[PDB]
Amino acid sequence: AGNLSFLATSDGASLAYRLDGAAEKPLLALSNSIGTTLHMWDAQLPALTRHFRVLRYDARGHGASSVPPGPYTLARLGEDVLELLDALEVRRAHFLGLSLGGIVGQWLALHAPQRIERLVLANTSAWLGPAAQWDERIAAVLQAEDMSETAAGFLGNWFPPALLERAEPVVERFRAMLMATNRHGLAGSFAAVRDTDLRAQLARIERPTLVIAGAYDTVTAASHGELIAASIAGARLVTLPAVHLSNVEFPQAFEGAVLSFLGA
Template sequence: MQIAELGDVRLHYRVDGDPDGAPVVFANSLGTDLRLWDPILPHLPDGLRLIRYDKRGHGLSSLPAAPYSMGSLVRDVEALLDHLGARDCMFVGLSIGGMIAQGLAVKRLDLVRAVVLSNTGAKIGTPEMWQERIAAVNAQGIEALADGIMERWFSKDFRAKPELALWRNMLVRQPAEGYAGCSAAISGTDFYTPTSGLRLPALGIAGSEDGSTPPDLVRETVDLIPGSRFHLIRRAGHLPCVEQPEEYARVLTEFLRETGHI
């Protein structure tokens, strides 16, 4: 485990694979930590520098006072990649991580050569919806929302498995202030215009049973980028890297090869 001191935040990060390999950066969803990507790592090819991190207010990273802005989340990973000397990364972002991917690509094309926008949107939900969720978390904690979140995150089949408890526990053990802070960042973000100006290789990944970012939203977002492609993973919800890790890794590996990253 490593910590990067980045001014107003300390980010927990982990680097696996080949330290001299082409960098692939993973940004996870609201309410999860970097272990979200554990299921796909064994299925990825050798020779890659795999960089994962906990965004502010999540996992083992520090907990600055909420609310957060999307700009601060983008600056965090920008500073982390500068700290690590990582350039020309493939950036894989899921949900809020996909928003961070869009924001970083717009800001720093020297850092991002290709993006995977997974289970995300240029805009997710409405400010009113997010304000209701923030109020509920602040008043009752994440536990009060956990069962509804599991329904949006996972397919019916997966919700019947014992493994569901692992992901529910991960969710409810995140700091409520961090969850609320990142919810505020999503609430204030509309990337339709900046994302439509991107010109880089892009892959959209969606889950057929995603109750948080439905496939049409993911397709609409990735279609903003000319030449992008889209892949639908069936029998999966908001976290297809958990439910269908082999397919997720296969599609990602194909994209890495297509873009010359491996």
């Protein structure tokens, strides 16, 4: 019933979002990996809502949200969060974004610093070029028969071989998210990633930031997160022995790192 609310964006899409935790606590907004839904954070909810009110949403083209055609700009993915915040009459929120969500985070700190408090960037990067590889992934996702190959591509990049070797429920949970993802959502988001190079801009960020990186990350290399930490003035870096979804692989260490940084 009250599972979801929907935001009509200014350009004609519809974003699904929900709030968890006590209304009076400070707002922490989460933004998702490409190909996932807000349910990728389900396990972090108990620890996080102990201290913050948690805003979650399905990104443009994903999950319970509507699906404009591609390409999406990074700016538009950024405007989406701002419009969510405007809708909730929130002036300022802590922000935690993983991967693509982390790229949205960087954009927000750069173009709407006044809307952000503390900033957490997990398994992400400021530049994933060169760009051709992304046009190839867009052409391939658009022409696929179903998302099966595409999903197996992600999963192979998201988890360690050990978990893939055998069948595990969590792996299939994420497979389902991928299978359910419209190809335009993936292709529009690929285009945003393709067009992004924020490396020369990071040194202009003035928000307290924590960067979480995965040592064995094959999607967004650990070294990309290390560069983010280096270039953002005063940023801290926490590397986990994880692949790409480190909150899934190490929920305790991930939550500990996030909570102590946001003020416990």
